[PDB]
Design a protein around this ligand. Structure first.
Ligand SMILES: Nc1nc2c(ncn2[C@@H]2O[C@H](COP(=O)(O)OP(=O)(O)OP(=O)(O)O)[C@@H](O)[C@H]2O)c(=O)[nH]1
Ligand SMILES: Nc1nc2c(ncn2[C@@H]2O[C@H](COP(=O)(O)OP(=O)(O)O)[C@@H](O)[C@H]2O)c(=O)[nH]1
Ligand SMILES: COc1ccc(/N=N/c2cc(OC)c(OC)c(OC)c2)cc1O
Ligand SMILES: [Ca+2]
Ligand SMILES: [Mg+2]
Lengths: 426, 437, 155
């Protein structure tokens, strides 16, 4: 396992995808031009995982940019790191989606999917040992969710033995009070349960609460929310990009974190929580399992952990990490399943991000994530009971039965989390 | 002289095999470039160390070893390490995509793409042997390659080398330095499919070695480096009878005769003493009776179990160094009634003793201090079933919920194999209970 | 049939077409196959001007469809703060109950329309109103972990 092909779809996917490249390029010593300016040798050991190698020691990010809105490409080009992207990887259509999952998945998006797959094969063949794909998108819109899931099913047919990893942004009325978002989100979850190997659930509801209440921001913006997203995506991919003890394998991560195929939705966490303008080991382990440090609006103390992976970063005592983690597992033993022995793995890396000296990234497969799916299901049913704006989807060639099946599939997902949450070993 | 071929599978098998062959060269006096000044017979010979080392026309001594792993990361260090000039380049076999800690990926899918190439390279080494007696297989229980590919390899070697013996050095999983959560699965799956094809297996409990490095060596956070150096010290004491002159366990067939009373119970327990830290270079040299007393202490064992809870069926003592035979006879005489050592009624209550009058060799950079005498006890006790019980319990916890099973079913393996492998482990625990534990 | 043309005119938001049709005797209280009046569709699609014009021409502000949905139910669900105040201004029942047991307060709480929740409470929204599952508006806030909504319901 080696190279990873990055894909960003929609306005949110390209926005959170652009911030992902601006952060790791700073950690690897890469300037917007591409010339390596790092001051340590470890910044180039596993650099080939996310970057190509152009002539002249130039590093080209293995990223594909797609959106039905033609104005998003200028939003990315005008960015700071918007010049390093390969001009051949800009696939933008003419007609947008208008927050319609149907236009992205059946009409407007079905015309643009073949143009993207041509550049996916172009990138997948320039890899020495391709391991999987990485996608950033929101589930509330129409492009990143309707065409994003369609792009996944297309890649799943031609690359079935490769790992599909997504960073899906969940909608929230506290950030976007668009009443058709529970539709597109529910229809996307119906596809993500079947065609993804591991999905990071980034909830705008939790992102808003962290900025508004934890960071004391009366009016959080998309820049403030994405600051928590960029720091999260950097931590969950620290082992994939830097030398350490973990094998940096997408499949090894999926085998050790997915006990049941449908339960592959992770609850990311990060500590410490800081803002854009501005701790010990026992404090990082404490804040890590705190509900205030979760990127999903779910209380982990309301459910039971199935599998947990904690990545520590910075210069810290290797022995103390094994002490505080083992101690936290005892004080919260009622929140770990007893039929999965040794279900908490600990990783530690020596290169922390900039601005901090220590950090901790939490990746938990918890049954408490059902509270997220219950929130979207309750809003979906409320709108679907009255059939509000249902003609916006049937007019694009969608069947009404696809809503009840998505509602039924998502309710079955919730019952599955509750099933293993009440199970015992004896 | 009968040649022995060593096989190293997976990261654990390769890294431990690297430390063992380093120690073999230091004990035999072989330079890292394969030269041996004290080998007056150039181009060949009939010496005892030729069981593990072949000789070329230029006087180079090459190990009879094969390194195989489904990914090249671990073996590439052996290709650029200190002994990069020692091994045949065509005996370092590497794939591209590993088994991802999946027994099914190593046995049914990924392992099939390189199994025929590995056997052809083993065939080349077998043709150079005049009287090949068997193989030594190094692998882990928890890894996808160490469990899946090794089982596929052992099944093939039985068809191509039916009369030859096969011995294992297996790595028992430990939560302190484990890699995967499904390691209880892989360990049970590989034990069931390899039980028929293995004549004798020495299990190394990573937790037992981990505690020894903490207590005896004062190492707070032991790494794989500290574990493998101590493991190689014990592997050398076990294979010393095959590589030097002696009258105990002189060939692989005698290993089964002295340690294995019945085919299925071929898991002897190994104990080593003394283990002294290198920070104590001016330590007191323990007597023969003191190091022999330390063989029946559970804290010095390579597998976490209490031999007082079980009965012995065999017991061999391999001494190394300044050891007078009358001191061993006096020691065993006292350590016969002064302790609660129980032998089964159908076994001759005795102790086989072999003495090598050369003290153990320490490696530069190791954690162990030079000792003038040491002992390695190999005993087949029913108390080692305690380790199978710990492994079978963690297996039942996850399989009762069918957790992580879809990863195995999706790789060409049927779910029914999980049950018959667990039933085989149940029949193995009964084998020890029918003897007494 | 001018009633069916008035339904689509209120849905599409054609203000000029609504006036001309009502001048020719169009049934302002006409219904579709599901019982939706022109006031239902106008409050659903955010056509505030058509809402006020219909209310001045004999539109039933408390009309229900086959599922018991009043214009206040749909306006609170979609989140039209301006239309909700106009409906409440013309005597809309703030505590009307649909077939699912929901009130306008329930739908605004579920969809996160905090401003609408604040307006309904000031107009006499029953905080003790239960749905067919026994949940009230405050039960939705606690079950969903919405502390912002919980503070509004604790005035
Ligand atoms: N004592 C010791 N144990 C090791 C060493 N390396 C790995 N292990 C153990 O082996 C187990 C995992 O098996 P590995 O050998 O690393 O995996 P593999 O054989 O390469 O198979 P893959 O899953 O495909 O990578 C872990 O539980 C480790 O504790 C080592 O160098 N020394
Ligand atoms: N965290 C975050 N969320 C975003 C951002 N941009 C859009 N979103 C969310 O995405 C949803 C809208 O989907 P969008 O991606 O804009 O539509 P699309 O063009 O069809 O993919 C809204 O609910 C927003 O909350 C962003 O920059 N950061
Ligand atoms: C519950 O048991 C376990 C949980 C997690 C384990 N490993 N976790 C990872 C996580 C990674 O990135 C976040 C890796 O980088 C992609 C990664 O590469 C190997 C492993 C291992 C476990 O035995
Ligand atoms: Ca010779
Ligand atoms: Mg490996």
């Amino acid at each position: 396992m080696r190279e990873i092909v990055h894909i960003q779809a929609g306005q949110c996917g390209n926005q959170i995808g652009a911030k992902f490249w601006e952060v790791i390029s700073d950690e690897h010593g890469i300037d917007p031009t591409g010339s390596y300016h790092g001051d340590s040798d470890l910044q180039l050991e596993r650099i080939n995982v996310y970057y190509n190698e152009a002539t002249g020691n130039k590093y080209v990010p293995r990223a594909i940019l797609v959106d039905l809105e033609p104005g998003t490409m200028d939003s990315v080009r005008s960015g700071p790191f918007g010049q390093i992207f390969r001009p051949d990887n800009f696939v933008f259509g003419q007609s947008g989606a208008g927050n319609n999952w149907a236009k992205g998945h059946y009409t407007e998006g079905a015309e643009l999917v073949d143009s993207v797959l041509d550049v996916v094969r172009k990138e997948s063949e320039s890899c020495d040992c391709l391991q999987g794909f990485q996608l950033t998108h929101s589930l509330g819109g129409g492009t990143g969710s309707g065409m994003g899931t369609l792009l996944i099913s297309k890649i799943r047919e031609e690359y079935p033995d490769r790992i599909m990893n997504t960073f899906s942004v969940m909608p929230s009325p506290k950030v976007s009070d668009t009443v058709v978002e529970p539709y597109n989100a529910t229809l996307s979850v119906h596809q993500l349960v079947e065609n993804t190997d591991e999905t990071y659930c980034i909830d705008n509801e939790a992102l808003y609460d962290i900025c508004f209440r934890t960071l004391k921001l009366t009016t959080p913006t998309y820049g403030d929310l994405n600051h928590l997203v960029s720091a999260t995506m950097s931590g969950v991919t620290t082992c994939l990009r830097f030398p350490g003890q973990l094998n940096a394998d997408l499949r090894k991560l999926a085998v050790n974190m997915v006990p049941f195929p449908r339960l592959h939705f992770f609850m990311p966490g990060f500590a410490p929580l800081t803002s854009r303008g501005s701790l010990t080991v026992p404090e990082l382990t404490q804040q890590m399992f705190d509900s205030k440090n979760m990127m999903a609006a779910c209380d982990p103390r309301h459910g039971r952990y199935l599998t947990v992976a904690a990545i520590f970063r910075g210069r810290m005592s290797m022995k103390e990490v094994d002490e505080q983690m083992l101690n936290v597992q005892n004080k919260n033993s009622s929140y770990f399943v007893e039929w999965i022995p040794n279900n908490v793995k600990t990783a530690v890396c020596d290169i922390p991000p900039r601005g901090l000296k220590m950090s901790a990234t939490f990746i938990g497969n918890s049954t408490a994530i059902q509270e997220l799916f219950k929130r979207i299901s309750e809003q979906f049913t409320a709108m679907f009971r009255r059939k509000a704006f249902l003609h916006w989807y049937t007019g694009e060639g969608m069947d009404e039965m696809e809503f009840t099946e998505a509602e039924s599939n998502m309710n079955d997902l919730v019952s599955e989390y509750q099933q293993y949450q009440d199970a015992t070993a004896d | 002289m009968r040649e022995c071929i060593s096989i190293h599978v997976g990261q654990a098998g390769v890294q431990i095999g690297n430390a063992c062959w380093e120690l073999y060269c230091l004990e035999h006096g072989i330079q890292p470039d394969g030269q041996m000044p004290s080998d007056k017979t150039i181009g060949g010979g009939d010496d005892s160390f030729n069981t593990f080392f072949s000789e070329t026309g230029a006087g180079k001594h090459v190990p009879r070893a094969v390194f195989v792993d489904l990914e090249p990361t671990v073996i590439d260090e052996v290709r650029t390490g200190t002994y990069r000039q020692l091994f045949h380049p065509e005996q370092l076999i590497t794939g591209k995509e590993d088994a991802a800690n999946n027994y099914a990926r190593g046995h049914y899918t990924i392992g099939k793409e390189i199994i025929d190439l590995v056997l052809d390279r083993i065939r080349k080494l077998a043709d150079q042997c005049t009287g090949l007696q068997g193989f030594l297989v190094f692998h882990s229980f928890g890894g996808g390659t160490g469990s899946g590919f090794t089982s596929l390899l052992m099944e093939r070697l039985s068809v191509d080398y039916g009369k030859k013996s096969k011995l294992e050095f297996s790595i028992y999983p430990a939560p302190q330095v484990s890699t995967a959560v499904v390691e209880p699965y892989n360990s049970i799956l590989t034990t069931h499919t390899t039980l028929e094809h293995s004549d004798c297996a020495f299990m190394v409990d990573n937790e037992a070695i981990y505690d020894i490095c903490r207590r005896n060596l004062d190492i707070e956070r032991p790494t794989y480096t500290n574990l493998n150096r101590l493991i190689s010290q014990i592997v050398s004491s076990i294979t010393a009878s095959l590589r030097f002159d002696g009258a105990l366990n002189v060939d692989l067939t005698e290993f089964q005769t002295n340690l294995v009373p019945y085919p299925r119970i071929h898991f002897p327990l190994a104990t080593y003493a003394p283990v002294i830290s290198a920070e104590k270079a001016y330590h007191e040299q323990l007597s023969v009776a003191e190091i022999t007393n330390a063989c029946f202490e559970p804290a010095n064992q390579m597998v976490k179990c209490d031999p007082r809870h079980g009965k012995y069926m065999a017991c061999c003592l391999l001494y190394r160094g300044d050891v007078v035979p009358k001191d061993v006879n006096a020691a065993i005489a006292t350590i016969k009634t002064k302790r609660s050592i129980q032998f089964v009624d159908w076994c001759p209550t005795g102790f086989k003793v072999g003495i090598n009058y050369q003290p153990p060799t320490v490696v530069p950079g190791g954690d162990l201090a030079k000792v003038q005498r040491a002992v390695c006890m190999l005993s087949n006790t029913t108390a080692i079933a305690e380790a199978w019980a710990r492994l079978d319990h963690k297996f039942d916890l996850m399989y009762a919920k069918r957790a992580f099973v879809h990863w195995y079913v999706g790789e060409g393996m049927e779910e029914g194999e999980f049950s018959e492998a667990r039933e085989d482990m149940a029949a193995l625990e009964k084998d020890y209970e029918e003897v007494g534990v | 049939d001018l009633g069916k043309k008035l339904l689509e005119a209120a849905r599409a938001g054609q203000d000029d077409e609504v006036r001309i049709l009502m001048a020719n005797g169009a049934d302002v209280n006409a219904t579709d196959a599901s019982g939706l009046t022109p006031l239902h569709l106008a409050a659903t699609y955010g056509h505030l001007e058509i809402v006020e014009v219909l209310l001045k021409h004999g539109a039933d502000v408390n009309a229900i469809d086959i599922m018991g949905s009043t214009p206040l139910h749909l306006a609170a669900l979609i989140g039209h703060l301006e239309i909700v105040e106009v409906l409440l201004k013309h005597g809309a029942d703030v505590n009307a109950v649909d077939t699912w047991g929901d009130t306008p307060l329930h739908l605004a709480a579920i969809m996160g329309h905090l401003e609408i929740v604040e307006v309904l409470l000031k107009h006499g929204a029953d905080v003790n109103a239960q749905d067919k599952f026994g949940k009230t508006a405050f039960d939705i806030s606690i079950d969903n972990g919405n502390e912002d909504l919980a503070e509004i319901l604790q005035k």
